[PDB]
């Protein structure tokens, strides 16, 4: 039923680590990431 799609969606989530050093500088904090991707549509044709 690919005729009725109109820009469906896909997404995924990641997170990266951190390391403590404790020097004369600010402190670290854990950070996460969120992204969303879209879809593209293309046709195909042939005659007879």
């Amino acid at each position: 039923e690919l005729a009725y799609v109109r820009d469906g969606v896909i997404q995924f989530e990641v997170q990266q680590p951190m390391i403590a050093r404790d020097g004369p500088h600010p402190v670290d904090q854990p950070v996460h990431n969120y992204m969303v991707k879209r879809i593209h549509k293309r046709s195909l044709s042939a005659a007879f």
Partner: protein, 155 residues
């Protein structure tokens, strides 16, 4: 309660650590407020205007520009200190009298560089810097002194 942390350099001599521990309720200053800081800003070297130790009138302006903080209990490794300028709740705050003049109840405190005899201060040979602590007098003493230094200035 906002407190700032002062990093003590390692390899410090026990004699200097003992002398540093005696400075318990003195006032220090900071150029930029932050939780973690070093010792080079507390040193007199950070007061340098052009390339040299600062002048009195220059210190009068450095005291206004820079933030202020009060020292609290010191551990062998760290030097905790609390800020006074910005609005923050701080219970049980005690300061050490540094002026040769006595204070009494209901007295406003000001801040001025040492204009009396050579100011006592901690000296750090291994680190190579020397920190100096500001002097605190009441308000009336502040106005009388200021009027006299400017009179001598225009003279």
């Amino acid at each position: 309660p906002f407190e700032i942390e002062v990093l003590l350099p390692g390899e410090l001599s026990p004699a200097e650590t003992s002398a540093l521990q005696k400075c318990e309720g003195k006032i220090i200053t900071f150029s930029t407020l932050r939780h973690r800081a070093s010792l080079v800003d507390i040193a007199l070297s950070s007061y340098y205007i052009n390339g040299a130790p600062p002048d009195t009138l220059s210190l009068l302006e450095a005291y206004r520009m820079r933030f202020a903080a009060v020292i609290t209990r010191v551990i062998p490794g760290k030097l905790l200190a609390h800020a006074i300028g910005v609005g923050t709740p701080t219970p049980g705050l005690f300061i050490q009298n540094t002026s040769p003049v006595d204070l009494c109840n209901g007295d406003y405190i000001c801040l001025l560089p040492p204009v009396f005899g050579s100011a006592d201060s901690i000296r750090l040979d291994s680190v190579g810097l020397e920190i100096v602590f500001p002097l605190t007098i009441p308000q009336t003493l502040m106005r009388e002194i200021i009027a006299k230094v400017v009179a001598r200035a225009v003279e």
